[PDB]
Amino acid sequence: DRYEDVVKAPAPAGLAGFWQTKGPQSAMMSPDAIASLIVTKEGDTFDCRQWQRVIAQPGKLMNRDSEIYNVTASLDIYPVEREGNTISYDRMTLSRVERLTPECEKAWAKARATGPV
């Protein structure tokens, strides 16, 4: 399977948005590290994690056996589970937010500029 051939799933109701860790995550390098996930209504995603450096990766939602996953452009596959204003994602808890960090915002705009209109 190729990333290009992955069938992009529309976001289920309530999942589209910006999601960000609100406190220390034991999975991350240090307590001040932050992870964010963008989910568009069409099912495009962006996984942006930062501390001393930023690592950001576009992806796509996939529906497999009625469960939702993020599939990154490098073919990492991560189940996404939502409960209200929080998601479980790659061993972290992210909360719904209205705005992401500037460096996630900038990286997202940059990535999107090479994609379709």
Side-chain angles (χ1 to χ4, degrees), residues 2-21 23-117:
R2 296 198 307 149
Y3 181 73
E4 291 85 353
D5 301 324
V6 165
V7 176
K8 182 173 76 189
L15 185 60
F18 300 136
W19 300 90
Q20 187 165 267
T21 56
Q25 305 294 304
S26 64
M28 297 194 86
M29 201 55 190
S30 204
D32 294 329
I34 302 161
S36 301
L37 186 66
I38 307 180
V39 179
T40 73
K41 70 171 185 302
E42 296 86 5
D44 291 285
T45 70
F46 197 65
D47 176 332
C48 184
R49 305 186 199 195
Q50 61 187 282
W51 181 43
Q52 302 297 311
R53 294 182 291 162
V54 176
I55 176 157
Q57 305 163 244
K60 296 173 184 173
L61 296 181
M62 180 183 73
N63 202 27
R64 188 165 73 191
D65 306 316
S66 86
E67 299 187 289
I68 299 294
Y69 299 87
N70 188 33
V71 184
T72 66
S74 305
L75 290 180
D76 313 302
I77 296 177
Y78 302 122
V80 182
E81 282 301 300
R82 187 177 74 83
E83 204 73 77
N85 291 329
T86 74
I87 60 171
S88 175
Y89 177 69
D90 196 22
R91 306 182 289 98
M92 304 176 289
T93 299
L94 289 64
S95 298
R96 196 192 302 273
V97 297
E98 198 189 13
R99 205 193 169 180
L100 289 177
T101 60
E103 52 268 58
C104 188
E105 292 191 319
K106 282 164 175 161
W108 169 234
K110 169 150 57 70
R112 270 191 83 88
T114 67
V117 191

